[PDB]
Amino acid sequence: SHMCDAFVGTWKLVSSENFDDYMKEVGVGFATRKVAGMAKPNMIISVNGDVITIKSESTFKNTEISFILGQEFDEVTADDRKVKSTITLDGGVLVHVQKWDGKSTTIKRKREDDKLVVECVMKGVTSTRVYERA
Ligand SMILES: CCOC(=O)c1c(NC(=O)[C@H]2CCCC[C@H]2C(=O)O)sc(C(N)=O)c1C
């Protein structure tokens, strides 16, 4: 159904801005911030029917989520939070909200030119992570 076609593929992280501050706000501790911050994950996005799968593979961690748009699921994040996640499409942007411990963060993923741009926000702190095709 050509849902998410432009996101599908294998992507490599090529830049990150303000990620340490984002992680601090989320509650990531020092050692994990330092080692996570070094990671340059491959993000692999695929679609099969209504099910979207997003894998992230790096030297630090491999993560995988599979979901249906609009349908909440329990996610264990790379930093080991146990969150309730809901991912929707809003105007062509994948919007991923994570809830845990009365906290919330929002991750937006967009296609912009040949890049996939990820913006993540925790209170007033935004980080931008830019991926290119692998
Ligand atoms: C919050 C701490 O995150 C990490 O350290 C981190 C990942 N975070 C993400 O996949 C999301 C982070 C929030 C934005 C969306 C995502 C993005 O990075 O693009 S994957 C990963 C790995 N495979 O090793 C690590 C180490």
Residue numbers in the entry: -2 to 131
Manuscript text:
Based on epidemiological studies and animal knockout models, the isoforms FABP4 and FABP5 were identified as potential diabetes and atherosclerosis targets. The aim of this study was to develop a dual FABP4/5 inhibitor and, to this end, high-throughput and fragment screens were conducted with X-ray crystallography as a follow-up method on those ligands that showed appreciable affinity and favorable physicochemical properties. Structure-based drug design (SBDD) based on initial hits from high-throughput and fragment screens yielded 216 ligand-bound structures of human FABP3, FABP4 and FABP5 isoforms, many of which were at resolutions of better than 1.2 Å.
Compounds containing stereocenters of unknown geometry are registered as a mixture in our database, whereas if their chirality is known they are registered as individual enantiomers/diastereomers. In such cases, the electron density is usually the deciding factor for final assignment of the correct enantiomer.
